[PDB]
Amino acid sequence: KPINVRVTTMDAELEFAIQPNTTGKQLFDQVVKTVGLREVWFFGLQYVDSKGYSTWLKLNKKVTQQDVKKENPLQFKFRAKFFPEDVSEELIQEITQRLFFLQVKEAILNDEIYCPPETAVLLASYAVQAKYGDYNKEIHKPGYLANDRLLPQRVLEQHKLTKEQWEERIQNWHEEHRGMLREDSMMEYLKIAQDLEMYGVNYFEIKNKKGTELWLGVDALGLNIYEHDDKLTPKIGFPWSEIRNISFNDKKFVIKPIDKKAPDFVFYAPRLRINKRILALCMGNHELYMRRRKPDT
C-alpha cells in the first residue's frame, strides 16, 4: 500500500502520498512542482533517520531504502543545501528568494551565524518592513514588535540595552524604509547576511595528525581550516583554484595542493557519517562553482 509523506518549506507544509517504488528524485520533483520553484540546484530534502541523525535524502534511490524515521506521515524538510555566491545574480524567483530569506534569518536568530549588534538591528528592520510593511503611527502602535523574534540571543544576552531599547532601535530603522516593497526588503536582508563571515559555510569538527581539534568549513568558494576557538576567521584557506584534489578514505580526508612543491594536508573526521557528509558537500559546492564558470560544458 501507499506511504504518507509530510514535507515542509520555511513557510509551506505539503502532505501527500506516494508508491513504495518512488525515488527521492521523484519526491523532490514532486515538491518542486507543487510549490513552483525552478532554481532547484540549491535545495535538498532533509530527514531524521532511525537513530535521530539529520540526513539528506539520496535522490538516486527509493525514498524507502533510506532508513528515514518511521512515523505515520514520513517527515521531510525542504531546505537550501547550497548557497549562491551572490543572491542578486543567482536568486531570481521571488519564491526562491523568500525561501532563502527565511532559512538564513532563522539561522541568524538561532545564533548559528554570528552577527554584530548594529548589523543585527539593521537586519531586523528589513525583516519588519517585509512583515509589517511601511511604518504607520496610526496602525503600528508603540510596541507593535512586542512579540517578534528580532535579534539573536547573544545580542540580547549582551545586556547593553533592555528589550524596549532594542525595539526602538529597530523602529528607528523601520521608519527609514518607507516604500520598500516586501520583496525588496527580503533581498536587502540577504545582501547583508550573505556578507557575514559565517554565512553559508558548513562546519565539521575534525582533527589533524597531532590530534589537535580543528574546524573544517565548506562553502561556495572552497574549504577552510579554523582554529577551534574562532569560527569566524580561517587559519588556512583552500579555494577551489588552490586545490589539486581531495581524497577521502575512511574517516580520513586529504587535501592535495596544486602548488606541486607544496605538502599534503591530512585531517580526520570524528565519525564516518561525518566524512561522508563532507565529501557530499565538497562535491556539491565544487560542482555548482564549476557550473557557474564553465557553462553546461
UniProtKB/Swiss-Prot annotation:
Keywords: Actin capping, Actin-binding, Cell membrane, Cell projection, Cytoplasm, Cytoskeleton, Membrane, Phosphoprotein
GO molecular function: actin binding; ATPase binding; protein domain specific binding; protein kinase A binding
Record localization: Cell membrane; Cytoplasm, Cytoskeleton; Cleavage furrow; Cell projection, Microvillus
GO CC term, one of those recorded: cortical actin cytoskeleton
Main location: membrane
List of residues binding a 1,2-diacyl-sn-glycero-3-phospho-(1D-myo-inositol): 58-61, 276
PTM entry text: Phosphorylated by tyrosine-protein kinases. Phosphorylation by ROCK2 suppresses the head-to-tail association of the N-terminal and C-terminal halves resulting in an opened conformation which is capable of actin and membrane-binding.
Cell membrane keyword on record: yes
Domain FERM, residue spans: 3-293
Domain of life where this protein originates: Eukaryota
Keyword Methyltransferase attributed: no
Regions that span the bilayer: none
Assembly description: Interacts with CPNE1 (via VWFA domain) and CPNE4 (via VWFA domain). Binds NHERF1. Interacts with LAYN. Interacts with NHERF1 and NHERF2. Interacts with MME/NEP. Interacts with ICAM2. Interacts (via FERM domain) with SPN/CD43 cytoplasmic tail. Interacts with CD44. Interacts with CLIC5; may work together in a complex which also includes EZR and MYO6 to stabilize linkages between the plasma membrane and subjacent actin cytoskeleton at the base of stereocilia.
Protein role: Probably plays a crucial role in the binding of the barbed end of actin filaments to the plasma membrane.
Name of the molecule in the record: Radixin
Species of origin: Mus musculus
Name of the gene: Rdx
